[PDB]
């Protein structure tokens, strides 16, 4: 039956599919290579057989299958799409998550994870002939890393090597894309930023970050420069902490440039005497120091627009105190 | 020479027909000359306390037409908002239409704005669709000024997990409409949400598709 | 790999059944937790059973029990619940747990101090994860236990002598005497707390 | 009736979804109910998913808006791979209630 199906076969394919569902319950139990090239290769009834294999086979069977999918160090034989969908389905079998409330984690070694990111790159290359698919497969990578710092660092250095080896290929550009997305999702890795990422343009478009809420909290917190001297020293800690974060991790701040623009738009018009008694000029000094640190990564297109708005606010303040 | 303070005489006349004609002349003159529009804003603000409701409605229409390209300051903004308590629902929706086109200086202005809007919700609940339109445009046009208010708006806590705010509550839907609309062009905003805000986002997506964007 | 195993499916089935039982009669949930069960099951039974937030309504009663093992289980169960449900009442019971753990630090003898603080010290990183406002109390308690255990170490000759290891580095990750073990446990939870706060 | 859809007990949610399915005739176009059907569709408990399917059948028979909203979810649910074969089988005949519109029927 498997040989007949692998060979076109219009009407009778359903009959044969029913047959090997009947006599091959665990699907890939008998003659595994035939079924492996059936389910994952370069067909029509493939999704049905994939569903059967996902929801019908023993756990050792699926473990061996994922070890096969991630242990092929020469092939590029299995389809990236089918393999990745299968992995996602296996993670999210309902039987594993039955009973969870669903209101607010797979272990894989080094080389398997490298094969996984290579398969994601294969997916990206097949689709490009968008960043949507590469972002879509990203939570699978994070569900396999499980937040392990060693795995994140290994993927990072493998991607650096892939960027360097591939030069500026399309796949190299996609390597940079998922590398910047990984840096966004896990900035705990304190690796200094290579210039290849600084030349990357896609960071300032639509994206998702893990620390943006915190730095947003930082800048709104520092902005409330009320009269309490304990709060004033707290604001000083906030300003220098943002200074250190700017020098250490600049790009996350660079997605918070319209933030500072809006923060400074508010207080520009108020008069000089109230300017000094409510202590807002210190906030201007702090953000000036920030931006002085943030160069020269503060000088790309969206950064240029936010800087233009901030400088309009600055010169408005300057003209506001010409006397 | 003899052309000093003519428009103020027209607006301080007793015939409401003269005042309507004068304020329409102000609308057309400000439309032709954008730089002129700054000087007539305060005079138009006083006309929102006029005696004849047609004069007030016409002043609101003029303001909506001419405040398109210019900015309000705080006192002018709150005086604009304070008339929302008026009983005439027609001038209320007209004022809402103004607020769709107004421009705010500072985030405290937006905070005062939607505080007044939800107070209006408590007062005149039947207008809630119009106020949601107002907030739709308010968020859609000041996205960068709405974002530093978001954690205050959602009452989010630094470490506690909050009670899921009651969905299909008109004030809360209004707040979400404002926040999601500002998030249409502010990619850093969604990570500041909570999980039930994503759930409520899906709910407002399907039920209020015309209001809330992707 | 835990997640993908027949053990995990069985755990989910048992969790669904226990959820039904606890909804039907919450007194059963209270009785089971007063008896206690292996602490290894606590992440499983706290994650998989949505009706365990009722445990927060009798953690104070479970803490008050004279048995040391009931107290230890109460601390561990509370730590897992706090990491799950970060509520104001959850913090109130966490404050009570830190207070009771700092209180009986001066009530227990040498052996009982070791027995109580080896399982309940990994609960402090969970409290600190859930509740940043506990940092002052947690580290004051931790420095108190550390000073007590260092004093106890100095009393007798030891094979390791952690005092002269005052300037050793991180030990990121077994026949030693209990006092040195408890000293190392205090250090270990301190690095876990600091790692958590910086990550 | 709707308040018990927030209960963490999946059997209570299942009975609630079936209740809303029984009440689809008198209160269609109740959008929070639609949202409950949609969220409960991709749940993990099997009884909750079946109750959501039954309620979806009833509401698709009643509401045109619900039918057009749910046809895409059903398509991505069948084409989804984590959905087992029997659930797919129960999920297909929701589509017999897409007779409200010409483009709906064509899709």
């Amino acid at each position: 039956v498997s040989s007949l199906l692998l060979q076109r076969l219009g009407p009778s394919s359903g009959l044969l599919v029913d047959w090997l569902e009947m006599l091959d319950p665990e699907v890939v139990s008998s003659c595994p290579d035939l079924q492996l090239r059936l389910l994952f290769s370069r067909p029509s009834f493939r999704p049905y057989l994939l569903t059967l294999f996902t929801h019908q086979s023993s756990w050792p069977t699926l473990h061996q299958c994922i070890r096969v999918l991630l242990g092929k160090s020469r092939e590029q034989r299995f389809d990236p799409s089918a393999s990745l969908d299968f992995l996602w389905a296996c993670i999210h079998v309902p039987r594993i998550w039955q009973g969870r409330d669903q209101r607010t984690v797979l272990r894989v070694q080094g080389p398997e994870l490298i094969s996984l990111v290579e398969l994601i790159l294969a997916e990206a290359e097949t689709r490009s002939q968008a960043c949507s698919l590469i972002q879509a497969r990203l939570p699978l990578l994070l569900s396999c890393c499980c937040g392990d710092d060693e795995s994140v660092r290994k993927v990072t250095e493998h991607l650096s090597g892939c960027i360097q080896q591939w030069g500026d290929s399309v796949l190299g550009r996609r390597c940079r894309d998922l590398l910047l997305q990984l840096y966004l999702q896990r900035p705990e890795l304190r690796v200094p930023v290579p210039e290849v990422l600084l030349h990357s343009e896609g960071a300032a478009s639509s994206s998702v970050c893990k620390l943006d809420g915190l730095i947003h909290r930082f800048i709104t917190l520092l902005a409330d420069t009320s009269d309490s001297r304990a709060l004033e020293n707290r604001g000083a800690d906030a300003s220098m902490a943002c200074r250190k974060l700017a020098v250490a991790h600049p790009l996350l701040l660079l997605r918070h440039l319209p933030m500072i623009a809006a923060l400074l738009h508010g207080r520009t018009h108020l008069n000089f005497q109230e300017f000094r008694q409510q202590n807002h000029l210190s906030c201007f000094l702090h953000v000036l120091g920030l931006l002085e640190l943030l160069q020269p990564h503060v000088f790309r297109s969206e950064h240029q627009g936010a800087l233009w708005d901030c400088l309009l606010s600055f010169i408005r303040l300057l003209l506001n105190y010409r006397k | 020479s003899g052309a000093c303070g003519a428009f103020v005489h027209g607006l301080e006349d007793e015939m409401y027909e003269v005042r309507i004609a004068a304020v329409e002349a102000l609308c057309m003159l400000a439309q032709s000359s954008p730089s002129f529009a700054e000087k007539c804003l305060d005079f138009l603000v006083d006309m929102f306390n006029d005696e004849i409701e047609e004069v007030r409605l016409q002043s609101i229409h003029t303001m909506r037409k001419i405040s398109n390209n210019i900015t309000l300051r705080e006192d002018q903004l709150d005086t604009v908002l304070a008339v929302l308590e008026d009983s005439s629902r027609d001038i209320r929706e007209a004022l809402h239409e103004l607020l769709c086109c107004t421009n705010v200086s500072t985030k405290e202005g937006i905070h005062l704005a939607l505080v007044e809007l939800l107070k209006n919700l408590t007062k005149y609940p039947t207008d809630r669709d119009s106020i949601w339109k107002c907030l739709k445009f308010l968020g859609s046009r000041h996205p960068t000024l709405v974002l530093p208010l978001v954690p205050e708006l959602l009452s989010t806590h630094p470490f506690f997990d909050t009670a899921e705010p009651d969905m299909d509550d008109p004030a809360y839907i209004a707040v979400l409409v404002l926040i999601f609309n500002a998030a249409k062009t502010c990619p850093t905003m969604p990570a500041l949400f909570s999980d039930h805000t994503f759930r409520h986002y899906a709910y407002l997506r399907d039920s209020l598709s015309h209001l809330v964007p992707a | 790999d835990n997640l993908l195993c027949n053990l995990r499916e069985v755990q989910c089935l048992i969790c669904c059944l226990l959820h039904q039982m606890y909804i039907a009669d919450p007194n059963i949930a209270k009785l089971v937790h007063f008896q206690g069960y292996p602490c290894e099951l606590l992440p499983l039974t706290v994650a998989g059973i949505p009706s365990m937030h009722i445990c927060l309504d009798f953690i104070p009663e479970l803490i008050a029990q004279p048995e040391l093992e009931k107290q230890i289980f109460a601390i561990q169960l509370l730590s897992h619940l706090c990491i799950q449900y970060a509520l104001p009442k959850s913090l109130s019971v966490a404050r009570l747990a830190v207070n009771v753990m700092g209180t009986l630090l001066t009530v227990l003898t040498q052996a009982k101090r070791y027995a109580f603080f080896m399982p309940t010290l990994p609960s402090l990183v969970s409290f600190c994860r859930a509740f940043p406002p506990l940092y002052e109390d947690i580290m004051s308690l931790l420095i108190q236990i550390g000073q007590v255990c260092a004093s106890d170490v100095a009393t007798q000759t030891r094979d390791i002598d952690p005092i002269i290891t005052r300037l050793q580095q991180i030990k990121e990750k077994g026949s030693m005497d209990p006092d040195v073990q408890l000293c190392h446990c205090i250090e270990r939870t301190v690095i876990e707390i600091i790692n958590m706060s910086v990550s | 009736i709707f308040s018990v859809i927030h209960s963490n007990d999946p059997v209570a949610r299942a009975i609630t979804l079936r209740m809303l399915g029984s009440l689809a005739s008198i209160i269609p176009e109740r959008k929070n109910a639609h949202h409950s059907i949609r969220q409960s569709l991709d749940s993990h408990d099997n009884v909750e998913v079946e109750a959501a399917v039954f309620a979806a059948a009833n509401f698709s028979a009643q509401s045109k808006d619900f039918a057009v909203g749910i046809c895409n979810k059903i398509s991505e649910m069948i084409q989804g791979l984590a959905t087992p074969v029997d659930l797919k089988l129960k999920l297909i005949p929701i589509l017999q209630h897409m007779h409200h519109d010409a483009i709906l029927a064509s899709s």
Binding site: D101, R103 | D161, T162, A163, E164, P165, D166, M167, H196 | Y22, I23, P26, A29, P50, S51, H53, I54, Y85, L87 | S3, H6, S7, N8, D9, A12
Partner: peptide, 13 residues
């Protein structure tokens, strides 16, 4: 109550 999460939307009679 054991049947409702603490963060669930409260029911107001």
């Amino acid at each position: 109550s054991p049947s409702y999460s603490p963060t669930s939307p409260s029911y107001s009679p």
